[PDB]
Write a protein that binds this ligand. Structure first.
Ligand SMILES: Nc1cc2nc3ccccc3nc2cc1O
Ligand SMILES: Nc1cc2nc3ccccc3nc2cc1O
Lengths: 148, 148
């Protein structure tokens, strides 16, 4: 795992709430045809799966792009602020639905085995050109885990 | 909810992230018609989704039943030893695939918010009669998280 610090950054995209009928996979499927609408992209080759939490504890997910500030947020989309954090970066090898299994393995075992101490914040999936499709077993996705 | 349990034995079928295209959902689908084969069940109304770690580090999963010792393990099934542990028990409300989202929320935020420290071990999903089916949003499943 790689240790990285990043300043705060802005993400624009479409969101999913853990509390009816929707899924993260359905979120990405409806977002894909609309990704080109987002102006101000830092890097259109990179997308994010933001795993955040509402104050009430509800799981909150945003599929989006890092953007320079000051450009529009399209209809049906939202801006999300990722705060400045320090991260342990784990490379997940497998499908997009298997990301959930990697999160469980990381939090339940891999952090402690590496001596990395998690710090509650905003986690994210980092999709670059190593991501070949949601069901490709050879896809890679980096998982940024906030740490002390 | 804080629960201590002694060690117990679980018999059932395994999921490895290595079989391309296989999923935990398909594991349960192929396990369903064979559940009746397992002798020595503690309670056939309860099933377990064991989230464990292989020696090499991957996520490993067992769908199974708690059994008294000394009965056979059917062909294509395994015995899995759950060690004696202390657990924080969180009730997941939603579909079975959404369990993954609850695990991420619990480990990333909810444990720290409750003052609980995770203790790397064996996690499990606890399915009782509150579980209506894998894609029913009205289902409930208890998540047992090992802690100090
Ligand atoms: N029945 C299912 C249980 C699942 N549990 C998970 C636990 C951690 C990470 C991902 C998980 N995915 C599951 C999918 C299921 O259909
Ligand atoms: N592309 C996907 C990412 C997912 N990330 C998750 C992170 C934590 C818990 C469950 C998750 N499920 C995902 C499903 C996806 O299709």
């Amino acid at each position: 795992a790689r240790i990285v610090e990043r300043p705060a950054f802005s993400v624009v995209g479409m969101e999913y709430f853990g509390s009816p009928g929707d899924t993260i996979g359905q979120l990405w499927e409806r977002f894909i045809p609309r990704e080109h609408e987002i102006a101000g992209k830092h890097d259109p080759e990179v997308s994010y799966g933001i795993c955040a939490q509402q104050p009430n504890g509800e799981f909150h997910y945003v599929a989006g792009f890092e953007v320079q500030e000051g450009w529009p947020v399209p209809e049906g989309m939202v801006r999300f602020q990722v705060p400045a954090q320090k991260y342990a970066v784990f490379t997940h090898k497998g499908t997009a639905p298997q990301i959930a299994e990697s999160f469980q393995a990381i939090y339940s075992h891999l952090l402690a085995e590496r001596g990395l101490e998690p710090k509650a914040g905003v986690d994210f999936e980092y999709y670059d050109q190593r991501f070949r499709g949601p069901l490709d077993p050879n896809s890679q996705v980096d998982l940024y885990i906030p740490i002390y």
